[PDB]
Subunit: 314 residues, 3 copies
């Protein structure tokens, strides 16, 4: 099966600059090279080039709506394309607002996909409930069907179509949820596992329930939108919104290990890696590497080790 | 339901100065303000003022017995009072020796309460088994019934009455127990979960067994005496007795989260926070904040998030 | 029951110098003294003195084969001796290649022993599958029966006899396995718990299955070969091969605590501690201490605490 790396050097989803340098560091850490060494065909599509919408006025509170709507429009197109040709799309990137485009382009080719969202935040704020207007905290809002027409239309997102419902998404890692965001997820009966659940249940049982809940009836494609801040700040210190008491490095690998085993991985999001937010070179390296490592886990790399088929090492 | 903050800036329970500055930093970190934002009525009773017993000679090994006996006498009175009026008493404080007074005053108004003691130490040394004489490591000894008249009477604790028995107390976090202390807890068949049990069982199952063991028959009030050193030194570095390999920040929040859900929280002890023991400002801040956070957990604040009832955020 | 400390300051098992300074630091940290304080008879046999084989040419890729074969030959003899007299042998040491000698000498006196191997690596590379030739990564290869005559004879290991089979060994901590190594352990149906299993199952259940799998039928002696790098780099930072996402300080104590309770501990290996690889004095101290602590756990020291029998502390 083929794999395609898509860089999405974008950062207008949030105020802190640096995330556009994300895909660049992930590659610099040998994400491709390493990937090639697995049982998958790798092809680097390069980093999409975004054209900055001049005079992008803030739609009420929502900031840079047109720049983000155009950036995501462009990507969704590219993702749909590689999905079309039967390959797995892997989106390295800047902020998490690019998930709007990634999950959209994916949904087109596979309208029956479900989403496993590993993040410390829900990112389900509507243009009406954000307190910052930063779009990187509203992706789920544009993609959900139930949240359709529950908020005014935004400059540039016209092209979007609420493709997935609240019964096809699952959260794992939540620990910092806004009042409104909590309202929406309790209102729409969305399935999730907050750090407290992860604590009570254990990561093993979490993944167990997440699959039987999303693949119970029909076995559909899986889109893994992984927000690097879903691990405790200790492991992935270089991000915009660190939040203590989160997933651990082991837990994050186990979650990507189990998803691999389901053989249903169709799309991936290695979002929020910001090479400029590390208090020391170490931290940034720590962060870029676990991101890399998490990605390789999604595509084979097992901790127990791996060996090439049909080869007798003795 | 009402809540009442009672500062007890005392520190003669142990040699290291600084803990009396405890309640002051907890408030400085917005403990009240934040508390108010929950579904509870908050009322700051202020910091009790302790009068130093002059010429307080050491009763054999036990040090500052009269100062501690008088400090705890004063508090017990105050705690009983707010307990009397039907409010939850929250004791911020200096050393853990003030637990003698807190649990006493509480016991009066509710003689059927049980105690969940999150600490790395047992603090069940009798004036006869301490090796330091520091009283902050003997609280349980004065409160237990079975340990009645098993040690000589001390200058100033006359007013105390062994109110609870060893079948109403539960330990969670133990990892540094003296020879004698271990003897006593094995002798009196006291229930506890040492870091090893927490390791074997998982925090989820720990809490499960702790409740069915203390609320199995009758559902009684719960007194949570939380010694901040019960978390690993990494999370709460500013204390008198750091001990590695302890509870983690997540575990600590889960323990306070579950206790909240039992709806039986009557008294709380946020003991041992020492603003002057942090190797760097960071450490102190780290410590004061998790202490704060643990307290808010006890009264509502959930990681999955919260929203105000009867309010339609859409 | 008696205990005997045997230093094996050897380091030709791997390229990085420093490990021969291992036993010296472990003792410098009071390993003996502390040990004495337990219910065991302690006797320091001192550090074996190894004679360097001059002109030790590399057998193909395998390096320093004669120096290592002679070093291990010497030790096996000493270990068999103290095992003979009915005492427990504790081998402090340099690299893990010395396990060949330790487990051999042990097997002689107790041919029915099983091995619990706490390590991040399998160390089951045959002189034919190593990529470095470093012997500290091939111990199991020489000791296994099934791997008999599957590789050419090496200069100096003639004296060895594949004494244990793949159904008497168990791995716990694996997270960095070579392709070949993985092949061998899957081929020989060897039992193990990789960090992923530890994650899914929990350490408690791990130990549970490890015992019922090795002591299910017959209750035999246990040889614990503990590779200090089996803990995450955070706790034992001073080693040759750090690997992230490994066992935690608590987990490591639990594993040694449970093995103690089985009352079957016959031999111990406190391998790989390298006092010269610590980025700061702290790290080395951190490392030497947990090593020490893990050892004391094997012989009694419980976290819940200990008290001397027949002594009424009241
Ligand atoms: N509540 C915050 C959410 S911050 C979004 C964090 S993320 N996961 O990087 O998208 C907001 O007001 O935007
Ligand atoms: N074993 C020690 C116990 S130190 C008490 C620690 S605490 N939890 O802060 O009260 C003593 O001799 O007092
Ligand atoms: N695959 C490595 C294994 S490194 C052995 C690590 S240890 N546990 O210290 O023996 C090799 O090529 O020797
Ligand atoms: Mn996000
Ligand atoms: Mn996030
Ligand atoms: Mn205490
Ligand atoms: Mn304590
Ligand atoms: Mn090893
Ligand atoms: Mn190793």
């Amino acid at each position: 099966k083929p794999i395609e790396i898509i860089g999405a050097p974008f950062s207008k989803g949030q105020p802190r600059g640096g995330v556009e340098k994300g895909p660049a560091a992930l590659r610099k850490a040998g994400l491709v090279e390493k990937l090639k060494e697995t049982e998958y065909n790798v092809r680097d599509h390069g980093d999409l080039a975004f054209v900055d919408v001049p005079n992008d006025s803030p739609f009420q509170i929502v900031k840079n709506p047109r720049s983000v709507g155009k950036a995501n429009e462009q990507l969704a197109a590219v993702v749909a394309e590689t999905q079309k040709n039967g390959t797995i799309s892997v989106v390295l990137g800047g902020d998490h607002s690019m998930a709007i485009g990634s999950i959209s382009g994916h949904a087109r080719v596979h309208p029956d996909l479900c989403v496993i969202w590993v993040d410390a935040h829900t990112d389900i704020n509507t243009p009406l409930t954000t307190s910052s207007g930063n779009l990187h905290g509203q992706p789920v809002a544009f993609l959900l069907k139930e949240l359709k027409g529950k908020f005014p239309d935004v400059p540039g997102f016209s092209w979007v179509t609420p493709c997935i419902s609240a019964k096809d998404i699952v959260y794992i890692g939540l620990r910092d949820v806004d009042p409104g965001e909590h309202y929406i997820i309790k209102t729409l009966g969305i399935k999730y596992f907050s750090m407290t659940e992860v604590d009570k249940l254990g990561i093993g049982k979490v993944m167990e329930e997440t699959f039987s809940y999303l693949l119970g009836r029909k076995k559909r494609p899986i889109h893994l939108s992984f927000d690097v801040d879903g691990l405790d700040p200790v492991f992935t210190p270089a991000t915009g919104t660190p939040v203590v008491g989160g997933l651990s490095y082991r837990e994050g690998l186990y979650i990507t290990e189990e998803i691999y085993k389901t053989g249903l991985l169709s799309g991936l999001d290695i979002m929020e890696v910001n090479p400029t937010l590390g208090k020391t070179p170490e931290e940034v390296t720590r962060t870029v590497n676990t991101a890399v490592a998490l990605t390789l886990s999604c595509f084979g790399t097992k901790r127990e080790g791996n060996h090439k088929p049909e080869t007798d090492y003795l």
